């Protein structure tokens, strides 16, 4: 409304990434949460 139609109020920033099929080594805790993950394709180590 008048201040001394309104659109795009505020500022919005979002990050977009695209999933690619990869082999991931997954570390499983007793809880079952994946504490550590590794991508073989990314590096020789």
């Amino acid at each position: 409304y008048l201040t001394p139609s309104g659109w795009t109020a505020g500022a919005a920033a979002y990050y977009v990434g695209y999933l690619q099929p990869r082999t991931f080594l997954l570390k499983y805790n007793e809880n079952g949460t994946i504490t550590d993950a590794v991508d073989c394709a990314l590096d020789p180590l």
Partner: antibody, heavy 120, light 109 residues
Framework: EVQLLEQSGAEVKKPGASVRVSCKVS????????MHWVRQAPGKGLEWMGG????????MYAQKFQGRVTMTEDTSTDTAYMELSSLRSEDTAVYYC??????????????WGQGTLVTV | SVLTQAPSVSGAPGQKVTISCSGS????????VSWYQQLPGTAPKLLIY???KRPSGIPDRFSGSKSGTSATLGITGLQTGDEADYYC???????????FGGGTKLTVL
């Protein structure tokens, strides 16, 4: 921002009648903003009328004119009907459709319907 | 109506002269004031709201003040097209409604 449609276009009612006033909007939707009404007699001044109350959420009615004029609202079609009844001598005059924020702290009439003269 | 403003006032073009409206504590005292302009047979235009705020499209020349129950509408840089009536208004809790003065029709001499 917003342009306002005519308060009731052109209406003529001879004595022994009564007339609704349907004020629509554009660029907003009806129940995001409150309407208002003012009597304006040619060669004369302003007399406020109808109106919505930001406080208490009621649609106000001017006490002096209370009970003679009523208001209804159709939210989707943006049609707000102002029905004045029981025609009298001095009550034929231009009527202005006004809009103020319902957020409160808004007395100024903001956009206008351009006014419509009635007939008694 | 319930407020105080003269029917008409006149001044020479390009000059600086204002118009005031005398209310009460029951109306102007605790409430914000607005001002309106209408040309003959036209749409009354909001001039200043709150006595320090300009609507979109208003020349900055216009200003305003509220001293007690008295509210002046700052009018400067008179133009040949500035002749019209200006209306004071403020919220009323007395009748719990909207009130106005009779209106003051300016004349640019």
């Amino acid at each position: 921002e917003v342009q306002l449609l005519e308060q009731s276009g052109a209406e003529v009612k001879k004595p022994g009648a009564s007339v609704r006033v349907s004020c629509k909007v554009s660029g907003y939707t009806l129940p995001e903003v409150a309407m208002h009404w003012v009597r304006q007699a040619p060669g004369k001044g302003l007399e406020w009328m109808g109106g919505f109350d930001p406080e208490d959420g009621e649609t106000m009615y001017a006490q002096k004119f209370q009970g003679r004029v009523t208001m209804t609202e159709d939210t989707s079609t943006d049609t707000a009907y102002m029905e004045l009844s029981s025609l009298r001598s001095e009550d034929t005059a231009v009527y202005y459709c006004a809009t103020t924020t319902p957020f409160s702290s808004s007395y100024w009439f903001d956009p206008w319907g351009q006014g419509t003269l009635v007939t008694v | 109506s319930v407020l105080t403003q003269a029917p008409s006032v006149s001044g020479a073009p390009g000059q600086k002269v204002t118009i005031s409206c005398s209310g009460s504590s029951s109306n102007i005292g605790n409430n914000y004031v607005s001002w309106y302009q209408q040309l003959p047979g036209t749409a009354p235009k909001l001039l200043i709201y709150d006595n320090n705020k300009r609507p979109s499209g208003i020349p900055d020349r216009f200003s305003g003040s509220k001293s007690g129950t008295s509210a002046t509408l700052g009018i400067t840089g008179l133009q040949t097209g500035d002749e019209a009536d200006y209306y004071c208004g403020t919220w009323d809790s007395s009748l719990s409604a909207v009130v106005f003065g009779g209106g003051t029709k300016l004349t640019v001499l």
